[PDB]
Amino acid sequence: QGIQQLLQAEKRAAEKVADARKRKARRLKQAKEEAQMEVDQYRREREQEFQSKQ
Amino acid sequence: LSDADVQKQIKHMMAFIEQEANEKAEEIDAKAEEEFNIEKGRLVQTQRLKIMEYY
Amino acid sequence: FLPEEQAEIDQLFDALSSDKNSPNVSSKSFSLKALQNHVGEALPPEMVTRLYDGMRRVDLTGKAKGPSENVSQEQFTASMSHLLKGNSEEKSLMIMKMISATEGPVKAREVQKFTEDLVGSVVHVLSHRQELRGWTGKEAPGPNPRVQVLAAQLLSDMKLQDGKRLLGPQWLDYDCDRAVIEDWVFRVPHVAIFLSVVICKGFLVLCSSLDLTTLVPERQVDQGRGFESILDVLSVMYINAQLPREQRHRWRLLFSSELHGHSFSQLCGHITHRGPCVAVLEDHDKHVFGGFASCSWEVKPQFQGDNRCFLFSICPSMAVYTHTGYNDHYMYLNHGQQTIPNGLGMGGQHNYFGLWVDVDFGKGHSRAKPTCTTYNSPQLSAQENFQFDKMEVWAVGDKSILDADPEAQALLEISGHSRHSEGLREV
């Protein structure tokens, strides 16, 4: 039917945002570890400071 | 003749305006990537000003 | 045609076919030597030849193998019946039958050459007819770089039938038939507008029901100050297209860095409370960008503005980014606080704007790294944090504290505190 099957299109509708909020709660701590990969950018100044000392 | 009119009307909402609740859903993924870059800036611009000032 | 217009369309052909320098011709027809005569210096040479070979390949009867060698009134009135009043199935017909001497789909490399053959000529007819209204954007010796980057913007709406846009060096070799150019003249209004000013301004048909007040705005600067702008005339004919229609006629000067100092306190004093205005600035790497504010600028911490504010781009590329409604963080203006940022900002959020001008004037950022949030707009500048020297704020459409209180200057002198400046300030 229609009103027997409209919520069957709405449960699939509401189950597309819960993965959009679970990916949003992941993307915060997804690359905060790669926001510690700027402590790999500290290397290129240190060997360069070892290069100005060289 | 009668079912050919009621098969169109169950496409009025099912894939046309209920599909846009799925289109309004996956553009919080444009809003969550902007928050991710704030913390990516907020942790670089508090430490890259520190671990480069040492050198 | 109306008989007001049917009068002066034959009054152009009757004076043409009576040429004296071309000898083997009759009274009913002209030849191509006199069509490059009355235009004079109002059109470039690369278009007056296409003025010939776009009108000559009309088929009127239906039997001939191609174009006729003498253009008659039947072959003239029908082509303005295709262009000046015709429909989309008729309009791009005289686009494609101007390109190749053979019929067929015209290739995607040589529609680009025609697109840079048209927009270099609208600035030739409008300057020779003296309708610039002050907007004389200086031509570069060599090619004008704003003719080039404007012409490829129109070809971005060129939707081939595949659904995939023109990308990479395979963008030159598309068999673009009448199937695919006929929505392009439907989607892009300016390729329909610019043909009505290259033809109907040198030919001087005064009965034309166009509007030239709303195509090119009027530059209103105060006199006495020799002032050149950042934006030349093809750029101010680009930004003027995406404004509301009600405001497109007059662009008044509000702030400019080479006349009113290089200060943010002058910027915030000249553009506050002056209605909707277009801020446009150019950094060190020749990247012109900016944005438009829909309401007045007002100094307050809150995010002000509504959905008509947009960001654009001119000199790297020409594109316009309207609102997306994810957030209403539209405009921003703060003037000397310490917990929230001090400057001008549009898009994004606090410290993550899509366009930001700081109080330490000549600096800013467009930190929309993937895109922006309010405007779906990219990183505008070349770097992440640019530096600029020229800024303009243009409105669209339409004493001091030292002399304020005479009791406080009486109490300051009584309390022992000096003046530090007599004979240094005026009165």
Author numbering:
A (entry chain g): 6 to 59
B (entry chain d): 3 to 57
C (entry chain U): 16 to 413, 424 to 452
What's in the article?
The vacuolar-type H+-ATPases (V-ATPases), which localize to the plasma membrane, endosomes, and membrane-bound vesicles, are ATP-driven proton pumps which regulate intracellular pH homeostasis. V-ATPase is a rotary machine conserved from yeast to mammals. The V1 domain, containing sixteen subunits (A3B3CDE3FG3H), catalyzes the hydrolysis of ATP by the A3B3 heterohexamer to trigger the V1–Vo torque transmission via subunits DF. In this manuscript, we discovered that mEAK7, a lysosomal surface-anchored protein, can bind the V1 domain of intact V-ATPase and may function as an inhibitor of V-ATPase.
Since the yield of endogenous V-ATPase from HEK293 cells is low, we employed the endogenously purified V-ATPase from bovine brain to perform all in vitro assays. The mEAK7 binding sites are highly conserved in these two species. To confirm that bovine V-ATPase can be a competent substitute for human V-ATPase in these experiments, we purified human mEAK7 from E. coli and collected the cryo-EM data from a mixture of homo sapiens mEAK7 and bos taurus V-ATPase (hsmEAK7-btV-ATPase complex) at 10:1 molar ratio. The structural analysis showed that human mEAK7 could form a complex with bovine V-ATPase similar to human V-ATPase.
